[PDB]
């Protein structure tokens, strides 16, 4: 079986008490990576930390903070000053029409889903370079490959992060650091349960009916799972992915129709 070669390393995993971030944390812990996990809500984060500790043989430190604020980033970096692995993630922006998005709505989305990842990279990449090993994985969205009609804030902010990452990945590649993006299609998380319920109500169908329709519309016929998302993250973080950088890995069951 495949030794990812990262046992004993340390990962800062953002926005990881639930969903895709949690799947990444669990996958890294299963490969022996010590974790600092961040989310805003203490009780949920502490329960996730307990669950990961019990199922793995690694240290798990929970930091309850808002990763999109200076104080939150300072708290995360105080707990994890020199990570080998950084998984960037935060809550996504709200849906709507851009006629309703103030300058401050745009700034909030840019801060959460573009500038916060850039700042955490700025704070951690030189330590990785100095050690000759680093892995940075940004959780973005299929929206960067095909815009989502109601998510202009994501289409914009996450494409901005993607362009920045394209440049930085190539600049730091000679020092054993890779920077890649993981782009989820439709994944079976609590966030999607909330979205589907609101969409089903607006459409006059049941949420179970809408979920089944959305699954059938995806070529694979199902939603993605946090476990398989985390497995791809773990592979990117491994000693077997050192020649992969600046890449946008789309996990979507074939939903995006572009050849590239
Ligand atoms: N599932 C999914 O399908 C997706 C998830 N997405 C993003 O990936 C992040 C994680 O998303 P997911 O893991 O699903 O969210 P979940 O709620 O389960 O977990 C969140 C954890 O983050 C903690 N947390 C939140 N905020 C902070 C903070 N400020 N500080 C610290 N921790 C924080 C929180 O904890 P708290 O802080 O305590 O609240 C939880 O621990 C996310 O950016 C999402 O947008 C990417 C793609 C898809 P799409 C459908 C794409 C297609 O169809 O092709 C497009 C979304 C977009 O383009 O924007 C969802 C569409 C919709 O939503 O209608």
């Amino acid at each position: 079986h495949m030794d990812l070669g990262i046992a004993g390393k340390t990962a800062l995993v953002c926005a990881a008490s639930k969903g895709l971030g949690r799947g990444c944390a669990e996958a890294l812990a299963a490969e022996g990576v010590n974790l600092v996990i961040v989310a805003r809500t203490r009780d949920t984060l502490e329960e996730t930390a307990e669950e990961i500790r019990a199922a793995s043989n690694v240290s798990v430190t929970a930091v309850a903070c808002d990763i999109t604020t200076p104080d939150g980033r300072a708290a995360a970096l105080a707990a994890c000053p020199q990570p080998d692995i950084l998984v960037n993630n935060a809550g996504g922006p709200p849906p709507g029409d851009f006629r309703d998005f103030s300058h401050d709505d745009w700034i909030r989305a840019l801060e959460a889903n573009m500038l916060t990842p850039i700042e955490l990279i700025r704070a951690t990449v030189d330590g990785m370079i100095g050690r000759g090993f680093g892995r940075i994985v940004n959780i973005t969205s299929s929206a960067v490959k095909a815009p989502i009609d109601v998510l202009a804030l994501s289409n914009g902010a996450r494409s901005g992060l993607t362009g920045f990452v394209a440049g930085l990945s190539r600049k730091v590649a000679g020092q054993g650091v890779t920077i890649n993006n993981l782009l989820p299609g439709l994944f079976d998380t609590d966030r999607i349960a909330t979205t589907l319920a609101a969409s089903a109500k607006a459409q006059g169908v049941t949420v179970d009916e809408l979920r089944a329709r959305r699954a059938k519309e995806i070529p694979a016929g199902r939603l993605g799972t946090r476990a398989e998302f985390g497995a791809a993250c773990a592979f990117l973080c491994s000693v077997h992915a050192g020649y992969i950088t600046g890449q946008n890995w789309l996990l979507d069951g074939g939903a995006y129709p572009g050849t590239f």
Side-chain angles (χ1 to χ4, degrees), residues 123-145:
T124 61
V125 73
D126 292 324
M128 295 175 183
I129 290 170
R131 294 180 291 272
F133 180 93
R135 299 287 187 265
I136 298 163
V137 177
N138 308 298
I139 297 181
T140 64
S141 177
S142 70
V144 309
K145 300 293 288 179

Side-chain angles (χ1 to χ4, degrees), residues 4 6 24 27-28 31 182 229-239:
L4 300 191
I6 56 180
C24 294
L28 292 165
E31 310 301 332
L182 221 38
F229 191 85
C233 184
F235 184 81
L236 283 172
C237 293
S238 77
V239 303

Side-chain angles (χ1 to χ4, degrees), residues 160-186:
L161 180 61
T162 302
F164 169 75
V165 163
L168 184 67
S169 62
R170 293 155 170 105
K171 181 170 294 184
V172 306
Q175 280 72 47
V177 175
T178 67
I179 312 183
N180 294 291
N181 310 311
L182 221 38
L183 287 61
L186 188 64

Side-chain angles (χ1 to χ4, degrees), residues 2-56 58-241:
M2 183 178 276
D3 184 351
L4 300 191
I6 56 180
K9 297 191 187 300
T10 298
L12 176 56
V13 189
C14 297
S17 71
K18 308 199 311 180
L20 303 181
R22 176 188 171 146
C24 294
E26 291 180 304
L28 292 165
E31 310 301 332
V33 181
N34 299 303
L35 302 180
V36 178
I37 59 171
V38 166
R40 293 166 301 177
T41 312
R42 286 192 175 107
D43 289 356
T44 304
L45 183 63
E46 290 168 20
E47 171 61 22
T48 293
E50 284 196 22
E51 293 180 12
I52 298 178
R53 286 186 200 109
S56 68
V58 309
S59 174
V60 183
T61 298
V63 183
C65 69
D66 183 342
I67 201 62
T68 73
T69 68
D71 288 339
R73 290 188 291 275
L77 296 163
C80 197
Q82 297 289 337
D84 303 290
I85 292 158
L86 173 64
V87 182
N88 275 315
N89 189 33
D97 186 271
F98 87 122
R99 293 169 183 76
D100 292 309
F101 296 157
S102 67
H103 176 267
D104 277 5
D105 291 317
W106 275 107
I107 297 297
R108 269 188 291 276
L110 287 163
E111 288 179 343
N113 308 120
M114 178 184 174
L115 301 182
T116 284
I118 294 174
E119 178 49 44
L120 290 171
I121 293 171
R122 195 179 62 98
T124 61
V125 73
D126 292 324
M128 295 175 183
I129 290 170
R131 294 180 291 272
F133 180 93
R135 299 287 187 265
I136 298 163
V137 177
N138 308 298
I139 297 181
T140 64
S141 177
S142 70
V144 309
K145 300 293 288 179
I148 296 170
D149 55 355
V150 299
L151 288 174
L153 294 169
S154 177
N155 303 337
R158 303 196 198 260
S159 293
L161 180 61
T162 302
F164 169 75
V165 163
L168 184 67
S169 62
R170 293 155 170 105
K171 181 170 294 184
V172 306
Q175 280 72 47
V177 175
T178 67
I179 312 183
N180 294 291
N181 310 311
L182 221 38
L183 287 61
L186 188 64
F187 275 72
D188 183 15
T189 69
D190 282 359
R191 172 50 59 188
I192 281 304
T194 299
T195 290
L196 287 174
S199 292
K201 188 199 296 183
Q203 293 182 50
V205 302
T206 77
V207 69
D208 289 347
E209 282 168 344
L210 181 59
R211 181 184 292 272
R213 179 220 296 177
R214 293 292 296 275
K216 184 185 176 187
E217 288 170 350
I218 297 163
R222 64 173 178 84
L223 278 64
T225 70
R226 71 183 185 196
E228 72 192 328
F229 191 85
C233 184
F235 184 81
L236 283 172
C237 293
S238 77
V239 303
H240 304 295

